[PDB]
Design a protein around this ligand. Sequence first.
Ligand SMILES: O=CCCCC[C@@H]1SC[C@@H]2NC(=O)N[C@@H]21
Lengths: 35, 113, 112, 671, 91, 91
Amino acid sequence: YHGDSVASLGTQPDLGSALYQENYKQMKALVNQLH
Amino acid sequence: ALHLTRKVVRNLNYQKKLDVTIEPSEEPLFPADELYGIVGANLKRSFDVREVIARIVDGSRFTEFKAFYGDTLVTGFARIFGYPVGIVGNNGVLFSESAKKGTHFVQLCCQRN
Amino acid sequence: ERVEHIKLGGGEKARALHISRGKLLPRERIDNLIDPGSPFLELSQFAGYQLYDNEEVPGGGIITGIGRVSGVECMIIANDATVKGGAYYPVTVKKQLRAQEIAMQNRLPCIY
Amino acid sequence: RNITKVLIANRGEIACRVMRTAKKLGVQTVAVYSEADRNSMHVDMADEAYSIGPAPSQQSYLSMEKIIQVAKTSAAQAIHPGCGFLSENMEFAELCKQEGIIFIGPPPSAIRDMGIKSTSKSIMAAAGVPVVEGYHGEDQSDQCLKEHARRIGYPVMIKAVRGGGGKGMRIVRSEQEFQEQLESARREAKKSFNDDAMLIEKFVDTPRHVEVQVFGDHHGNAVYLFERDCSVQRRHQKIIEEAPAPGIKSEVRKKLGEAAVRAAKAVNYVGAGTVEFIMDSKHNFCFMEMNTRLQVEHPVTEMITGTDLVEWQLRIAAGEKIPLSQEEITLQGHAFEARIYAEDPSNNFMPVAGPLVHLSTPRADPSTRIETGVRQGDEVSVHYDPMIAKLVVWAADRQAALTKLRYSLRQYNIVGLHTNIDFLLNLSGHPEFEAGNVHTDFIPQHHKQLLLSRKAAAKESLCQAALGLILKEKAMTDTFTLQAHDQFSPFSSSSGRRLNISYTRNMTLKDGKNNVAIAVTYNHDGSYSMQIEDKTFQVLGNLYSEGDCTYLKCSVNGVASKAKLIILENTIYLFSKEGSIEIDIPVPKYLSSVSSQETQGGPLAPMTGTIEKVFVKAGDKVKAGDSLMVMIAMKMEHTIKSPKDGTVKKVFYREGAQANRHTPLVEFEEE
Amino acid sequence: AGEKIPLSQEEITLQGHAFEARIYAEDPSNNFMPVAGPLVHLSTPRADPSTRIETGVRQGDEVSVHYDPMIAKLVVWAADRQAALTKLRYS
Amino acid sequence: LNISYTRNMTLKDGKNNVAIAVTYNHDGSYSMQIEDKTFQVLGNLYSEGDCTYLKCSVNGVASKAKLIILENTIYLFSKEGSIEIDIPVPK
Ligand SMILES: O=CCCCC[C@@H]1SC[C@@H]2NC(=O)N[C@@H]21
């Protein structure tokens, strides 16, 4: 029997937050550089 | 806590494996409650153990081993819920022939697992 | 009918006290632990039946059996706190040891 | 003109409707679609399909240039506009003609002449069709206003030209009270709106709406198809339509159609047209307007005549003469149509968007027609119309047709969003509707009975819900057993069996706000003994599948019944011809997010809409119920209100900004 | 068997227009030369009262030189000749 | 990882070899360049009756055709027309 409901991890990040905007911009540049 | 316990067991990474051959299950051909009348509560009276067997094995199918030798003991092959089983049951006083017949039968079952 | 009486464990006063603390009754715990609707094979229901002269110990103060948890057959060993506060009588130890022997010989996980 | 390929300049059910007929006739079909409609049923229905741009209809289905470009690129000889969008657009019909493409509809002249009320009334009056109506007057002399009040006939209503909410409105029952009530209305209007201009609009006594399906050809021959009652409307929106209109004699309808037919010949209307009439309690009728298109409710006409009006539109647009003479046309039986709307009747019929998680439908027979443009899992869109499907039935008698529709509505199941289906069931079972005593105010007048609150469930329903839950668990057990090597172990059974005793399970179910405790005992024979409060029930049943819908066959205390079972999230849905019941399974606290969200500040925009007003500065102290912002969405005003008495930390939007649905509008200081 | 004609001349009536086209295994390029081969895939327009397909062959059958190679006969019905022709091409 | 796969595939139309470069996009679509023209193609195979059908969109134009691949030939049957394309055979 595998029908049990369970909790899940994760939370929705604050896309509007300045920290998220800055972190996304910096990481994206690194990924583009890698590509 | 009980909900947590179920989660813990699910993470045991265990799967059951069967060493024996399996066949589809079948109900016995006779009602089980008839065992009340057949057996009773008086140990002095005797009954045929085959009657008990006929009401618990799949389809009431039974292959008797050494039927006419040491008849006070009954041995044979059957299936319960699809599992193979070797049945040994008393049908009277134990004799030398009965003990020998049982010893032979037990070796057969052990050989075939 | 004798099993029905043993089903009640310590009694109404003990059962009422047990629930008053927010705890489930021992047999309700097993019902919730095993898979929904699965059969439960209880063992040695009559342990301690009239064993001791003036003390009644329904089921030996412990409930043992085999049930399916998450699709796996397991041995379940639950103390009955309503019976003598869950104290271990000599038969209680023997019943538990028998359950452990069954679990080991058949490789059944043990839930205490 | 040989029409071998047609472009359908529409979407949803009407596009599928047109394609069905085109395909039967062996005509190739071209769909157009927005980005949001890429996977829609009509795109699939027409192997040929072209993208016309983004989801907003102004940039897609209303883009005349894109539709003409696709018609040229696909080499479609004709465009079928369907209903709405470009179907009543004169510029589009003239553009089709300039580009050598056959517009399947009326000529651009007939569209323009009917699109202006004053022009259309003048043409209709000249054609013999009556033009009487109650109208507002822009003159403001007390003598002029009084003369108009006499002409309309008392009682009349004085209203202010500017403003809403009943301010500056006065009822005038006779000529003697007119002056006092006019001066009272003016003073209130001047005080409230700085405007003393008054309007004079009233109708003395003409209740009920009647329309006529008319068909014309390029030749100019014109025919009518009896009449339809569309009086049952909410805010002018038609809800239930019927054909023929009840209580109108065959002779009266024949005369009614003939006056309309003369007007149709007068404009030499080509293609299907509808003459809308207002009919009084004496069956006097007056022309209201002419809709220069196929009506939404044309299926009730098709069911009583045995005609295909889209097939006639294609033939007549190709240039062929009308297929049958007026003598050939015959009427058999009566028919009804109900529109399934993604609306919440309990919340003032607010439109609702969302997924069609379940969309079971009644089986279709020649009498039962499901006009559905949506399929299970389709999402209703904020950009397009909220209609889900239209249900039409034909029967020998009108009473039998009403019975069939109600049985059919119960078979229709919609989970994932609110619908008007239960409202349609209450309406179609209302005594005045059964009698045929319908008029345009029917829904307002009988609002109290049509909107029905929830009633506590019976214990038998709770027993059935518990049985369904148990059977679902049994099905899950069988599913697990399928993949195991030990296929026949007795442990895989759902007997719930014990040695020398019986297993009793304590289950809890929530009906509304009430928790119901059910003690279920697993019997050896496979039945269940359920005790609710002091009553015991003997329950036995099983699950069987019809099509894709699981059905529960159960017997409670010897009473046998069948119902459709759906278990979604923590709610058990039971659908039976008696009714539908929802039962909630309690959610364990541990599974519920511990530390549940707290101090929520921003009421979220009801939908994507422009911000019209902002009532809060960056730092402002507000109390619960203080309006913060006003938003207009699809022309519907919503005022956001303060959730808490906390001071406002910040505002995320300014006036004129477009705010997406469920986006935070205000930030509140942490307290 | 001996029964009389079922319908009188007055009862007999003419409705619509029908076209019949006979599919053949003949290859037009070699002047309509008859061809014999396996029919690995065979598919036809869906049957309906208007569209009637008369065939003696099934997918997986093999055409043989021994007999005439006609694959099938296709019949379509409609109100007028042009509409019937449009259906015939569609089929 | 970090790059896109482009497959160089050749098909023969009549006597003309055609080279198609197909880039397998992350979304599951395929971008195909033939000569100087680039086409965005997305599609699935669905079965009706015993006939596999290809539902495909090329540059946003959507179509349905019956697809049979037998031997080294791809057969696409549509309402508009039937096209047969050949797969070159390795030496
Ligand atoms: O704009 C969209 C249609 C509904 C609003 C149009 C308003 S109704 C009052 C005024 N008179 C018109 O003819 N149009 C606007």
